[PDB]
Ligand binder design. Structure first.
Ligand SMILES: NC(=O)c1ccc[n+]([C@@H]2O[C@H](COP(=O)([O-])OP(=O)(O)OC[C@H]3O[C@@H](n4cnc5c(N)ncnc54)[C@H](O)[C@@H]3O)[C@@H](O)[C@H]2O)c1
Ligand SMILES: NC(=O)c1ccc[n+]([C@@H]2O[C@H](COP(=O)([O-])OP(=O)(O)OC[C@H]3O[C@@H](n4cnc5c(N)ncnc54)[C@H](O)[C@@H]3O)[C@@H](O)[C@H]2O)c1
Lengths: 319, 319
């Protein structure tokens, strides 16, 4: 029932997954276990989320009861900023494999085109914005291609099935494609009605790169973080346009926001933090949006971005 | 007098220059010569403008008459898109050096972060959007850093005093600073009240990279090319905000548009096609815009870009 997408790497990836950002460590396993019982097979995690160990417990439990087999679960992780230096990539990937308790990951992405100064794992993990000098941000000179090559070596070693990037703008993705042997299979970016970036999507998809959208509900995710920008932003759930369309097909505005991405061949990893939400977030492909619909949602685009490194320390990623 | 800007390379660069784009071949010579007589010392040229030979004649005459010395002329040139591949960088700089009739260029910039397929000088020069296969675009897999490394060499060889980039978005500039030994000394981008990219300026400058703005008169230059987007844009010279401010200080809209950039440490290279405009475009630093003035102009920024590779062949540089 949950459609698959063949990545450029030849491997399949579910178009509907379970998000692991802000998934409390205390119940992450229980919740990952439940997600699996509900049909979810892909889990979007990351080293920065600091719950790969619990996410692992969840997957292991499901396997031990015989509900699924390793190859049926698609695990996605992300290399954090402090580990871009070629000599530390495998080290971080090892930690991820150790916490997840697996021999490989299905998808490993460059979390950010930012390279923080290396902080030994034993000193602090996950490092977060810690750069080894108190509260100061510190960076290290490591071009993106150097990091990508280490990743390619790790793919030949069988430690990673598919590799990709996250939070990459169009010009950086183009330049990585000029020196990549294995081309990025995925581009994961903030995608929602307030930040559509239609040209980026068009380029990537035309380039054979698969798109995975995060924060499909826009500011909602950051409101729960008490962020000034997101709070000042009208929710998509109560927006006249989304509501109208939702009423025309007799659906929920939530189902509309996800269908809007799925219908265009984009993968989603909604954050289901309630049982009822687990089901809803993977049962939305029951209707079709018309050209008119897309044109209406298209008007909501104002280029509003919630996840911006510019807020951290003025990192020019999106400027 | 025209204040200078000390580049990160150590060489001084005039804060005001003479643009050479669309400067006709038959009169290019005489025009450059007149500008020198008028006080201009810097000239922004480029292989793609197809007139560096005449630009050279111009400067040669000035020198021969004892008007100026080579050391007093700041010549900027740009590496066109077909010459990114390292083995072709030197030959292209060579053709520029002979055309200009000098041993070195004060500044060489990667015109665009786009690598067209190579086309021999003899087959066609300048190639423009020509790639070697009719009207089709053909690209080479050459990462920016490779081209940049080629340039660094050329500097050590005394064939270039300073290097830099042009039309590079934030993420791209950041990655280059990661693999560069000689940091880009200058960033040249489209810059005016409709496309202010304030964060880009801030980031670049705080990094010692000097900003050189182009198309300071907004849609103006591209209107003189019958470009659809430019013809449907209210001119900056008629805009109420600029009018009000100009009247206040009794200056021309043109003078206000150039001071807006200059008072903020950004260099300008207006194209002057009239003896009077030639003089005005370099005598606008006789007043200062107030904090309120900057606030009112700030409201104009709608991010309207007139020079976009997206129009050429959907090249994702600004997405
Ligand atoms: N690579 C990156 O930079 C990055 C950044 C952010 C998130 N992500 C990933 O993408 C996932 C989703 O993004 P997100 O964290 O912003 O969450 P989201 O946008 O999917 O959901 C945000 C919130 O909306 C609510 N919600 C979910 N389903 C709902 C429904 N049916 N009805 C009403 N409310 C509902 C929940 O309270 C939830 O916290 C993450 O879990 C993470 O794996 C990646
Ligand atoms: N690196 C790049 O990608 C790039 C792209 C475009 C231009 N440039 C450079 O920057 C320069 C400036 O850009 P541009 O050529 O597009 O145009 P501009 O902004 O210098 O001026 C555009 C037009 O306005 C008019 N103008 C000039 N001075 C005026 C005045 N005082 N009052 C009223 N009208 C006036 C002229 O007709 C001129 O053609 C070029 O000469 C070129 O060297 C670089």
């Amino acid at each position: 029932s949950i459609p698959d997408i063949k990545l450029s790497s030849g491997h399949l990836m579910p178009s509907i997954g379970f998000g692991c950002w802000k998934l409390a460590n205390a119940t992450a396993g229980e919740q990952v276990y439940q997600a699996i019982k509900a049909g979810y097979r892909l889990f979007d995690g990351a080293e920065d989320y600091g719950n790969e160990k619990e996410v692992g417990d969840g997957v292991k439990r499901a396997i031990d009861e015989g509900l699924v087999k390793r190859e049926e679960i698609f695990l996605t992780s992300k290399l954090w900023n402090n580990y871009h230096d070629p000599k530390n990539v495998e080290t971080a990937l090892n930690k991820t494999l150790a916490d997840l308790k697996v021999d490989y990951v299905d998808l490993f992405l460059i979390h950010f085109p930012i390279a923080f100064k290396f902080v030994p794992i034993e000193e602090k993990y996950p490092p977060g914005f810690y750069c080894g000098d108190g509260n100061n941000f510190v960076y290290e000179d490591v071009p993106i291609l150097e990091t990508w090559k280490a990743l390619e070596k790790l793919v030949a070693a069988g430690k990673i099935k598919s590799i990709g990037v996250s939070n990459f703008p169009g010009a950086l993705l183009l330049d990585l494609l000029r020196g990549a042997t294995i081309k990025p299979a995925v581009l994961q970016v903030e995608h929602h009605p307030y930040l559509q970036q239609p040209k980026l999507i068009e380029f990537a998809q035309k380039a054979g790169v698969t798109i995975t959208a995060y924060s499909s509900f826009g500011p909602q995710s950051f409101v729960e973080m008490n962020q000034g920008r997101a709070l000042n932003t009208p929710t998509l759930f109560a927006h006249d346009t989304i509501k109208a369309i939702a009423a025309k097909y007799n659906k929920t505005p939530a189902e509309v926001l996800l269908r809007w991405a799925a219908q265009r061949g984009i993968a989603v990893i909604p954050r289901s933090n309630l049982p009822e939400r687990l089901v809803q977030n993977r049962s939305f492909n029951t209707f079709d949006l018309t050209k008119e619909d897309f044109e209406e949602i298209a008007k909501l685009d104002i280029g509003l971005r919630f996840n911006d490194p510019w807020d951290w320390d003025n990192i020019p990623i999106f400027v």
